[PDB]
């Protein structure tokens, strides 16, 4: 009641060393801005959000609890998605039970790394208000669309075996009987990585920075063994006009171990 919550700040470090985005309702405008902020520890509305801002990248300006306001936030491929919904309530101190569908309002191209967020609240000392936070996960859902196009119900397949039986049949209705369900599943609870004990870096300098290179007709081959293939060291100095992988993706190279490695060297004219 009396709009205590005013907005959010999303950021990684929440200081001036990293960019952050502030979305607030300032009483006479909705303002969104993404800059390097000197965020205060206690951000509230009497406007004590930040001291100074520099290197700004994005800006957007607009033209007995009673009120429940619901939002969903996601971040993806440099886009922050916001979904919104509202419901009148009379519950005293709990989250009312029920079903409501949120609708998109914002798709912002910020291109920042978000690991943390903090809410912005007014101080009067302070009025009674509550907010609630939950976390999202990849899941399969079955949605029911009505004749007008409204989503009025849904089924979460992972909740229990009956919900999966429903999702498998594609029905909210099930007749009496016994049905065969998927086999018992177990989810992993640990991570194991086993690699050989190697303490030496591969000889990039000797191969690439060799004083003399042979003729193509008399090409030379050299064995490579017992070494750590980092190749990020080359980023500082050595650069290649041609780099092509055939049987392997370039992205997977860092996570692999290689057997029977050989390197062949020669010199040709550009056209060849």
């Amino acid at each position: 009641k009396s709009n205590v919550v005013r907005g959010w700040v999303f950021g990684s470090t929440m200081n001036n060393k990293s960019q952050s985005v502030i979305i607030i309702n300032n009483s006479t405008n909705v303002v969104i801005r993404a800059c390097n902020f000197e965020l205060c520890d206690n951000p509230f509305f009497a406007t004590m959000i930040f001291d100074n801002a520099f290197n700004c990248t994005f800006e957007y300006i607009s033209d007995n609890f009673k009120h429940l306001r619901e939002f969903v936030f996601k971040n993806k491929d440099g886009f922050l998605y916001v979904y919104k919904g509202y419901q009148p309530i009379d519950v005293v101190r709990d989250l009312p039970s029920g079903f409501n569908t949120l609708k998109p309002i914002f798709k912002l191209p910020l291109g920042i790394n978000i690991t943390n967020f903090r809410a912005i609240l007014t101080a009067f000392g302070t009025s009674a208000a509550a907010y609630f936070v939950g976390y999202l996960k990849p899941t399969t859902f079955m949605l029911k669309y009505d004749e007008n196009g409204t989503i009025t119900d849904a089924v979460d397949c992972s909740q229990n075996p009956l919900a999966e039986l429903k999702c498998s049949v594609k029905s909210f209705e099930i007749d009496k009987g016994i049905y065969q369900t998927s086999n018992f599943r177990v989810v992993p609870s640990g991570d194991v990585v086993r690699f050989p004990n190697i303490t030496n870096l591969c000889p990039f300098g000797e191969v690439f920075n060799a004083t003399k290179f042979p003729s193509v007709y008399a090409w030379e081959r050299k064995k490579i063994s017992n070494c750590v293939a980092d190749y990020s060291v080359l980023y500082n100095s050595t650069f290649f006009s041609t780099f092509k992988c055939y049987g392997v993706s370039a992205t997977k190279l860092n996570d692999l171990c290689f057997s029977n490695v050989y390197a062949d060297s020669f010199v040709v004219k550009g056209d060849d």
Partner: peptide, 8 residues
């Protein structure tokens, strides 16, 4: 899955 990227 170990030696190829998603699309491939």
């Amino acid at each position: 899955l170990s030696r190829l990227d998603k699309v491939e």
